Amino acid sequence: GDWSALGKLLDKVQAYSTAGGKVWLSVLFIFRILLLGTAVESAWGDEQSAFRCNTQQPGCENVCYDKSFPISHVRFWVLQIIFVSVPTLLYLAHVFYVMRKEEKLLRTYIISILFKSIFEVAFLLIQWYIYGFSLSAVYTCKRDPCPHQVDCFLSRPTEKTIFIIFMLVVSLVSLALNIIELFYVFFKG
Amino acid sequence: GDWSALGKLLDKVQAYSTAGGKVWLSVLFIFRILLLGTAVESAWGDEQSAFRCNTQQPGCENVCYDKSFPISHVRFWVLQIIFVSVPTLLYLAHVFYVMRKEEKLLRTYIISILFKSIFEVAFLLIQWYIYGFSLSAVYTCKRDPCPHQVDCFLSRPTEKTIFIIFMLVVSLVSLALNIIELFYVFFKG
Amino acid sequence: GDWSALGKLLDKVQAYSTAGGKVWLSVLFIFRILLLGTAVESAWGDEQSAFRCNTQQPGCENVCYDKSFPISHVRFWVLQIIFVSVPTLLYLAHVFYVMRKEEKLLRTYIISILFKSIFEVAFLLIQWYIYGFSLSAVYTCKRDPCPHQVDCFLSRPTEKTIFIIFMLVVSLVSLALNIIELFYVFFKG
Amino acid sequence: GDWSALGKLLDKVQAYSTAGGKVWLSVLFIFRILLLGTAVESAWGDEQSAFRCNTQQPGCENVCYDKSFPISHVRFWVLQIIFVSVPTLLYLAHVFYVMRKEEKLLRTYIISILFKSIFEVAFLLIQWYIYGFSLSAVYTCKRDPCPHQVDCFLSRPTEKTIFIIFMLVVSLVSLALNIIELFYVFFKG
Amino acid sequence: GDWSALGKLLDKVQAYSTAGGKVWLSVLFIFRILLLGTAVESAWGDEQSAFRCNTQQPGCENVCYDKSFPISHVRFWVLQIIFVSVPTLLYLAHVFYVMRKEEKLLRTYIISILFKSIFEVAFLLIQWYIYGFSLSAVYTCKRDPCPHQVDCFLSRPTEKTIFIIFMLVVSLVSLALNIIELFYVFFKG
Amino acid sequence: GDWSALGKLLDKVQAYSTAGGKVWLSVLFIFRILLLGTAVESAWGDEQSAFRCNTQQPGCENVCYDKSFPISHVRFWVLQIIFVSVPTLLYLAHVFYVMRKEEKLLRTYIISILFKSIFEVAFLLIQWYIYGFSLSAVYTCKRDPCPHQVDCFLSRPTEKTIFIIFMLVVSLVSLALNIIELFYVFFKG
């Protein structure tokens, strides 16, 4: 029975955060995890199996899908959320070690928040560069195996576009909350 | 061993709710989650794989399925339940922070309930606009790849219609309970 | 460490039940859940994929399967068990609130038992009306896309019939136990 | 912290059992559950999908598989283990209620053991009648859709035969242990 | 809160084991379980589906796969690890009963270790007899349905061979540790 | 309630580690496990099913896939992480036994760290030898069943290349941290 230690650890890390920014950030994080784990994962299930091209050339479908999707959106979002979460976990464990020292910091919190913001904007920029924020039903593919130009058709482009916009909005809200947090720490300083 | 704290937290949030409205709302929520997680998820498993169109045009099936189902009903319902649940979690965590302040509100509960009602009615209206409340076995598809008009056939339209009506009834009951809750808070005020 | 509270809650709800009826009902419920979760779910896995019709008409298989199975037996049974379980959960939570009042009913138990009986008989009648209690290997399908009449063949009809009879027997036993419970409460009154 | 109550409940039920019969029976039960849950379930995964018949008749494969396998071996074994386990759970819960009476039997144990033996021998006899204890690679099918007689080929007959023999040996060992238990209770009486 | 009892039970069983043999055996067991549960299970996923034969004879692929693989390697390894684990569980539960007697053995440990060694060597010999320790890409199949001799091709033979060698090395290390354990008990005696 | 013992065990093992090296290593390990368990596993799902070759020769696809992928990257990475983790678990359990002795070492930590470094560099060298650090969309296959030379096409080569580079970077960071740890222990000595 050591429920008090976890409560004290939770209090210490939030002691340097805004009133209510912590709760909105945590709720938004669990919202994003729930959305990623159930809906978008099942939406992207048949990304290659339902992918089809109008050609008889063997191997054209493989290269055309590879060119159309350099990386799946779901795996990209998983990487983004992991990269966003890593600095927070680092800071939490560092504060845990600080408490262990106390039994026998603010600058690190600022660095973690700022790095999380950097990672979020970097992932957004990469998504804009590679894919944009929409998916087209018809993709024109010009790859070496395929003769001339071929037409290929994605799986559920519209629902994927909807989920892409949802994830973009979620990322933007998270970034805005992080900037507000940084501004509050600047105000305190 | 800190079972008392969770009980006190549960008591505090329900202190502003009707006698018995809380239990009906919670039971209905777990009912909806159980129905969504087991039955309707398996019902929508072959939505695109069993989807078929009477044509020889390559890529016509993809675009016709995309036009017929801009977003899957199951994923739409997952989004709806998440959006309905978010304000409740926000209020619960806010009350937790209020208790933390007490160790060392009603307006937020009203706002959360009202926003949950807004989200429920908005999702119902969106479902009515895009899909309606029934599914037809035969869908006439007129999309660019397909020549003229083609006939396509959905997977298990009748069982999906039954589950759609079930979810509509569940959403209506939840909205009615929320309005009764709001009326009770108005009566108290 | 609050094991005593759950024991007291368990005692209070069973205080109004017969000697031994509670244990048989609980064992039968867990039996039905185990049977539904493992065996019958896997038995119905290929209900549409292995479903086949003797025709060349595009879309005839879809409409014929839809007409043959308006709702899957497994999902129907899931709905039935959820509907049967809901009144019990309502009564348990109501008794929990009654204990909370005591810290600072029989009619509801009767109503819950009677409503559970009503739901059980209603689901049995619906199953009898739509399907009966057997499955035939060959189904004659007369639907609009299909020309004239077509012959279709179900997946594992015999094993499904066996499981249907098993579920019917389980439901009948549960209903009989519920009627015995109601008779005992009448005897007490 | 109520670890003592579960220990006392465990002691009370085993108080009427042989020295060491309890441990062998429990180990054998967990062995059977582990074998059923991992190996044989995956072995029977493609029972119908890999099932093939040498014919061009539509629907012949469905009826031939249905006739060859009235019920899957894995589901049959799941039913058998559930039926064997039910009397033990009934007796355990009855002893729990007896302890509740004590805070404020042997004949039932004998009945449960004997009924478990009956169920085991009944399931063995049913398996012998329907299937035997071996699987043949080639099955001759004479069903109405199929013209004359057709040849069908099972999926992995040899490995399935091996697992069938394993389950038969496990069931025989369990029955022998149950008979030894009954003989010991007779010796005590 | 009864953490002390499990620690005492752990101490009692290891009291008859070598210094460090216990930890190496436990680590090796968890290593084998982790390797079996994740890597080799996914490696053997398409053992029959990707299995192909150069023939037009219906049913030749089924019988050729059955003859090539009398039992899957993964299921064989699951059986082997279960058989190896059973004597250890028997001994642990026997020591638990011995402690229960104490509240109100070495020979069994020797027997369990020796039987575990016997089972390990028996499974290794069976694997050598049926399969050997390698898999060939091309299998020549001479079975009744197939005319003359046919050529069949396994799924991922090289990776399966690598995992087979890994499991062989793991089994050999476990057997060597068991023999060292037996020699130590002989030295003590 | 024995939370103190686990804390003491955690303190003892980290007592010989650098300030902050432990936390970075642990965070990196959980990062690698999360990346392997969700993203790369789903990325490699259709490695053989989507693998295609431009030939009519039966069995050419099987042998060409086998030659192209002697072992899957995901299973190789699972083996690598297991091999890296094993020495750490050995050291932790050894320290646990040392504490048990204390109730009634540095050289082992050095050996475990150095062996973990050896395993990491060995797996990196093996990956470089067999595969390199990139995947090509088109693979030229010259195997016995296939006539002359055939062209085969991998599934999602670009996304797999991205994940391969990610895993390479992760492994390099882990190795660098291990070398820094060894240098610190040398400095202490």
Residue numbers in the entry:
A (entry chain C), B (entry chain D), C (entry chain E), D (entry chain F), E (entry chain A), F (entry chain B): 2 to 105, 151 to 235
What does the primary publication say about this deposited structure?
Here, we describe the structure of a human Cx43 GJC solved by cryo-EM and single particle analysis at 2.26 Å resolution. The overall architecture of the protein complex resembles that observed with other connexin GJCs, with two HCs (connexons) from adjacent plasma membrane regions coupled to form a full GJC. The reconstructed putative gate region of Cx43 shows several narrow openings connecting the pore vestibule and the pore interior: a single ~6–7 Å wide central opening and six adjacent openings of similar dimensions. This arrangement of the gate region is distinct from any of the previously observed states of connexin GJCs or HCs.
Like all connexin homologues, Cx43 monomers assemble into hexameric hemichannels (HCs), also known as connexons. HCs that reach the plasma membrane of one cell may interact with their counterparts on the neighbouring cell, forming GJCs, typically organized into hexagonal arrays at the intercellular interface.
